[PDB]
Design an enzyme around this catalytic site. Structure first.
Site, PDB file in Angstrom:
ATOM      1  N   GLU A   1      -4.811  -2.527   5.892  1.00 24.73           N
ATOM      2  CA  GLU A   1      -4.014  -3.317   6.820  1.00 24.73           C
ATOM      3  C   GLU A   1      -4.821  -3.785   8.023  1.00 24.73           C
ATOM      4  O   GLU A   1      -4.237  -4.054   9.078  1.00 24.73           O
ATOM      5  CB  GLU A   1      -2.776  -2.546   7.296  1.00 24.73           C
ATOM      6  CG  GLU A   1      -2.992  -1.075   7.558  1.00 24.73           C
ATOM      7  CD  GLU A   1      -2.409  -0.210   6.460  1.00 24.73           C
ATOM      8  OE1 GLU A   1      -1.279   0.286   6.637  1.00 24.73           O
ATOM      9  OE2 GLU A   1      -3.068  -0.030   5.416  1.00 24.73           O
TER      10      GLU A   1
ATOM     11  N   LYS B   1      -4.601  22.415  11.776  1.00 20.15           N
ATOM     12  CA  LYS B   1      -4.376  22.689  13.196  1.00 20.15           C
ATOM     13  C   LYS B   1      -4.375  24.198  13.438  1.00 20.15           C
ATOM     14  O   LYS B   1      -3.359  24.819  13.759  1.00 20.15           O
ATOM     15  CB  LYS B   1      -3.076  22.042  13.662  1.00 20.15           C
ATOM     16  CG  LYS B   1      -3.171  20.538  13.873  1.00 20.15           C
ATOM     17  CD  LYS B   1      -2.822  19.777  12.605  1.00 20.15           C
ATOM     18  CE  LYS B   1      -2.675  18.288  12.873  1.00 20.15           C
ATOM     19  NZ  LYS B   1      -2.298  17.540  11.640  1.00 20.15           N
TER      20      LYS B   1
ATOM     21  N   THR C   1       0.841  -1.187   0.000  1.00 27.28           N
ATOM     22  CA  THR C   1       0.000   0.000   0.000  1.00 27.28           C
ATOM     23  C   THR C   1       0.880   1.242   0.000  1.00 27.28           C
ATOM     24  O   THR C   1       1.896   1.293   0.700  1.00 27.28           O
ATOM     25  CB  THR C   1      -0.941   0.023   1.216  1.00 27.28           C
ATOM     26  OG1 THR C   1      -1.508   1.331   1.363  1.00 27.28           O
ATOM     27  CG2 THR C   1      -0.192  -0.348   2.486  1.00 27.28           C
TER      28      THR C   1
ATOM     29  N   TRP D   1      -8.864  21.590  15.869  1.00 27.92           N
ATOM     30  CA  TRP D   1      -8.613  20.774  14.681  1.00 27.92           C
ATOM     31  C   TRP D   1      -9.879  20.768  13.831  1.00 27.92           C
ATOM     32  O   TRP D   1     -10.852  20.079  14.152  1.00 27.92           O
ATOM     33  CB  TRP D   1      -8.212  19.354  15.063  1.00 27.92           C
ATOM     34  CG  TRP D   1      -7.064  19.272  16.009  1.00 27.92           C
ATOM     35  CD1 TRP D   1      -5.971  20.086  16.051  1.00 27.92           C
ATOM     36  CD2 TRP D   1      -6.906  18.331  17.072  1.00 27.92           C
ATOM     37  NE1 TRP D   1      -5.136  19.701  17.070  1.00 27.92           N
ATOM     38  CE2 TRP D   1      -5.689  18.625  17.713  1.00 27.92           C
ATOM     39  CE3 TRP D   1      -7.675  17.264  17.543  1.00 27.92           C
ATOM     40  CZ2 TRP D   1      -5.221  17.890  18.800  1.00 27.92           C
ATOM     41  CZ3 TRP D   1      -7.211  16.536  18.620  1.00 27.92           C
ATOM     42  CH2 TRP D   1      -5.997  16.852  19.238  1.00 27.92           C
TER      43      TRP D   1
END
Lengths: 530, 530, 530
Positions: free
Chosen positions: B319, B429, B172, B434
């Site tokens: 994954e 940020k 990946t 956030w």
């Protein structure tokens, strides 16, 4: 790690703090930049150890270095391995993509990089991970390395560990699709230094390195640990001069003023130094340059010998220590004239102490050392890399049959002299024999209107791989392929059909592909032309 | 290997030879090319095992596959792991250099490659080492795979080994500079199949996979093991149809004629299928496509629901098995109208059996599942990759704090529903908060003269990273940046300074960089614009 | 115990805290006694864990339970194994001496016993050692278990350990002279739950367990973990109802009022429920009882099918998980009428996922699955007991030849259906063939004046073991042995001498010995009559 003091471990710290000779007044010189005594060198090594400890470098960490030849590289050659970390030497002459691949593969934690190598990093900066700090190296007082060193104290207790811990690593392009990483331990480096010092130090009157010499490298010093010379000179406690950028005039000035007597370079740099106008009125009869790059030519050796230079060749293949063989002249060989001198000094040489160096074909046979039977060189030395880093199948081919495969085809004389004839992959497999393309390249280069020649092989049903020549013509020179065919056919004394002159297939090409180092891309020419 | 028969090992051979249901008359169909029963499938698997044994493939070897979705890929999904070898799934949509890097890293011994993938190999053929054989796959009788299979017998004694031996691997791109290799064992694959079958098979009346279904993949099948679906369908003994090239008309014809009821695709392919003129007179009220590519949009879900399609979303990150969460609707949620249906079906979903899936900030805190507090998703599942292949420091960051880090920022409702809001690296940020760039991209895309929008961050001393917009205009559409600023300022209900509208910094760019898969290159736009 | 979080262990705590579906509002009901939500169930499990920790129970300890089906048994099914201790399930239907032997053999530390089971303990109280505490369970607020739970807090950190630690154990009488103890691990229980959920959950339209069901056991729940059903239902988060004493009227009332849809019982309880006058006006067309006790009769299956009950059989032998096979009907089998329905639903069934189930004679041969060749069933499953506890030679016979021996003689159809014909020890070894006594018992039971029939074998020099019949006559029924001989001789279609009718040796006995469970004591009849 717990060690009984009776059990002795071969470590680089023993190489530095227990030398053959130690003179605190002896000086290390960085060209027109800095000059400091051996006591200052030891203090700076301890300061660098403290600074590396402060940044969080530990036993398993890796530190990458990217600069020219200087006192800083000599300090990195010692301080990093003595902490127990791994010194990764980066080839700055590779492409940025290859450099990035090597950095990612080795997983460097801290990178020390010179200022004028910054643009190379600038195009691979965002691609890089696993790196925490960059230290910019400069030739003035605004160097980050110098500011880091001047904060630490000159006091460090260097640890003792197993002699089989890895000390240095670097990557070689080779013939594979990606660069291959080789590594060495403390024991291997110490043994290499000791063995080569025993080999070249004990010669009677020619090509010997002793405690009265002055050392100055002319090789890139990120290749093959600079032939192990910086470790050796430090062991002898001799004066060391580092030129840096490798400018021929600066090199000649350093040789004249610092009274340099021992060096190692490549044929191109030697030719540039000899052809410089500044060198036509320079005294050279104390200098013992060692040529080890590739295939020291006989004409260059003659030209250097007419300048009263003790020039001799050595062999190393970047995963063998590197030193395997050096030409040594017996006292009755020193009385021969310049032609016989240049004949012997251009050879590969006799094997150094603790080296086996057999000649072997496929299926591992031990063809005799008659002087004309060629074969691949396979060696066994105390300083060979066990395998390639993070590789399996190439590692198996490297040590096939219980011996390390050099990839060079050579013949060995009855007296022990070795003469490398070609590379294994570059051999033309005509019919049932193996001709070396190097002598055909030399023959074709002898033409008056020929600049460069590359010989490759192309398939042929009845005669296997047959040879093909790509030649570059000179200024306003136009000779047809038939003329070159006749020129090659004129010579004699070779096997195969007549003189193997029915399939030369010489062609004229404007340019020939070359690596980033400057070597012909025979693989590519194969891809382009077939 | 010696095993006591009392000790049971979870192997893929048990998945194939001990299924939930086995019908010898059930058929596997390769689109308009081939059609054979399950007994023939078992015979071909044994023949492929014999053929692989004949070529010298052993337990530790690796076999690479490069083709579309077909019976051959299904046979490779089984035969290679059952021998004990490693199945390396190559992403054919990567660049040739990345593909070559993955081949070199995984060290494949034999490569099975389709005919029309040959040019990709042709430019990296000479760069490739460690590969001994290439098998060319074709859609007619001149296929080398078919000729290899027809020589072997249909009799093989499949060995039994430890359940922790690696079965499959693939690479990946992620956010690193080089592709990362993930791997799974036999036990992990068997447990993933069993757990997902227990999760989606036990639903009451919506989005369930049962033994009466007909399966047909629409995902590339070299990604994430095709969500594990081919293993599951084979376990249920259901009819399987493989389309191959993914042409929308061929896909619609296969759905109509083969009576396909279960599938998995991506929003782009679903939109292409729904917008095709051929589909305007096609019956769709038996089809249960699963959308798992990325961020199923609410409008597409509504459009599919108006066509009587049981469309629902799933989450997997390449994954993690890959399946981690799937939307499941309770019986009182099925009675809601299409808007509330599309609201729930577009969510990330609830976690599947044997999954923890906490929400966590830096320093690993366990922010509550109030429904609006966002954080990174960290999971613990029986089918997670332990680390990256031949990697150390990225592996440490993957499992930092004892949990696998997904890289996705989301909030979890009190009832268990997850809604992914952005990626960790894509978070802006600003000051001490956030904000997620996805909602700003959606807001800016709402403009009538806007084609595509990419939001990045650029440094700012007093307010951290501030947002920047790159927009592409439509045909003969020219709206100044001030108009887009006012358009964004018109909306309400957001935090930060006023509504965080003083730093939008919208810019018009002709084109936006995209990966080889087709995703915006936010890293690159960062490199280009700052 | 130290575990890397990447390494995943299959534990019951993962089964409880990571279910397929979790609804805090879903309720567990103890019949007319108590009713509490799933959140209260989790709190009570944590409280029970704290209470067990307070009494000194540790990882290696064993806790014994003796009561009916209730919320307390469900809480013990979880809390004890999650601490790491061993849950010993005591068969309350055994004789007091056998119960005392099992308690002494398992070495229980704490015993939880119901109030109305106290007299059984009263006669073996002084004989018992190694037991430190007795907890009396009651159906009102004066229960010691409830008082113990209400002191602890609802907060526990459940430990993680190896998945191979033993979780549950119970004792089976079998054919040996003393009860044999079987045991299972956390991994085996989790895998059994997952596999059976994958097997029965994925069926199209018949005999499927899904998240919309309501579960209520009718089996003793100290046998075979109640077929693993309580673990499965908790995994699905479905409503659970526990009846307790198994009174047919209370059972019918619970089915009517709680809307129970899934259950498991034995043929006797099903017959009692169907013959109850209360059930003649009760709706049954939502109920999916599973019959697994022994040999579901075809007449009972027909009678249940006329009441619109999805009745189907399953196979388990108390040391095999227990589930090994379940009848599953394909969609074209659902269109058959009640006779063909009852034919298929009464069979043993097809093997479940991850089960081998070969048919094998002595010396382990693999007789074909023609449909009429009988042999012993030998299986390999992920949830089989490795051996008997504290036993050597019976353990060797259990796993003779590398397969677990079920002790049942059956034939397997070509389509995978299994039909159990008898037990290995109950086979009559006439001459060189093996007749099954079950069909002779069925034939003799067909007589109008016959109540019960038991067939045994008695030695005979020329024809091996020959059959003998013990019959019980009805009210004021007196038929001589010759009449029964002629009745058996009337039938046809069997092998051996004529129709094996020269040695029937039928005898009339007033009573036939039965176990404490209620099964004929064929061993004893052998002892009494020969």
């Amino acid at each position: 790690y717990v060690n009984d003091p009776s059990n002795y471990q071969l470590l680089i710290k023993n190489l530095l703090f227990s030398p053959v000779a130690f003179n605190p007044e002896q000086e290390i010189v960085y060209a027109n930049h800095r000059r400091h005594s051996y006591k200052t060198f030891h203090d700076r090594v301890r300061q660098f150890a403290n600074a590396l400890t402060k940044m969080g470098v530990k036993k398993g960490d890796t530190v990458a270095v990217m600069d020219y030849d200087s006192h800083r590289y000599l300090e990195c050659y010692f301080a990093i391995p003595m902490i127990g970390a791994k010194l990764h030497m980066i080839n700055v002459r590779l492409s940025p993509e290859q450099i990035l691949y090597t950095i990612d593969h080795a997983e460097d934690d801290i990178i020390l990089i010179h200022e004028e190598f910054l643009p190379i990093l600038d195009q691979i900066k965002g691609r890089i991970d696993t790196v925490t700090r960059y230290v910019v190296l400069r030739d003035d007082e605004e160097c980050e390395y110098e500011r880091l060193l001047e904060q630490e104290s000159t006091e460090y207790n260097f640890p003792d560990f197993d002699e089989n811990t890895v000390a240095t690593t670097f990557y070689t392009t080779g013939t594979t699709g990606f660069p291959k990483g080789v590594f060495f331990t403390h024991r291997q480096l110490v043994l290499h230094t000791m063995g080569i010092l025993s080999t070249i130090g004990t010669n009677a009157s020619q090509g010997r390195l002793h405690q009265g010499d002055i050392y100055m490298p002319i090789t890139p010093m990120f290749h093959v640990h600079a032939w192990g010379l910086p470790y050796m000179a430090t062991m002898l406690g001799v004066k060391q001069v580092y030129p840096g950028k490798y400018v021929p005039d600066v090199l000649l000035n350093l040789i004249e003023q610092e009274k340099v007597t021992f060096s190692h370079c490549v044929p191109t740099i030697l030719h540039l130094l000899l052809s410089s106008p500044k060198s036509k009125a320079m005294d050279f009869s104390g200098w013992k340059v060692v040529i080890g790059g590739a295939a020291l030519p006989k004409a260059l050796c003659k030209s250097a010998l007419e300048r009263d230079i003790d020039v001799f060749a050595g062999y190393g293949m970047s995963e063998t220590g590197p030193i395997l063989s050096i030409v040594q002249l017996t006292p009755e060989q020193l009385e021969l004239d310049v032609d016989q001198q240049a004949e012997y000094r251009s050879k590969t040489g006799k094997k150094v102490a603790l080296v086996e160096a057999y000649i072997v074909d496929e299926d591992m046979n031990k063809l005799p050392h008659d002087g004309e039977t060629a074969g691949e060189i396979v060696v066994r030395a105390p300083w060979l890399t066990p395998n390639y880093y993070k590789d399996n199948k190439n590692s198996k081919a490297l040590w096939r049959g219980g011996y390390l495969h050099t990839g060079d085809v050579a013949h060995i004389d009855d007296e022990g002299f070795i003469k490398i004839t070609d590379r294994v992959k570059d051999m033309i497999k005509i019919s049932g024999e193996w001709v070396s393309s190097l002598e055909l390249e030399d023959i074709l280069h002898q033409h008056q209107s020929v600049s460069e020649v590359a010989v490759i092989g192309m398939p042929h049903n009845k005669w296997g791989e047959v040879p093909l020549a790509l030649v570059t013509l000179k200024e306003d020179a136009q000779v047809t392929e038939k003329e070159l065919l006749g020129f090659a056919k004129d010579f004699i004394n070779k096997g195969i059909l007549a003189r193997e002159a029915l399939l030369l297939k010489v062609k004229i090409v404007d340019e020939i592909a070359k690596t980033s180092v400057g070597k012909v891309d025979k693989k590519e020419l194969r891809k382009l032309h077939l």
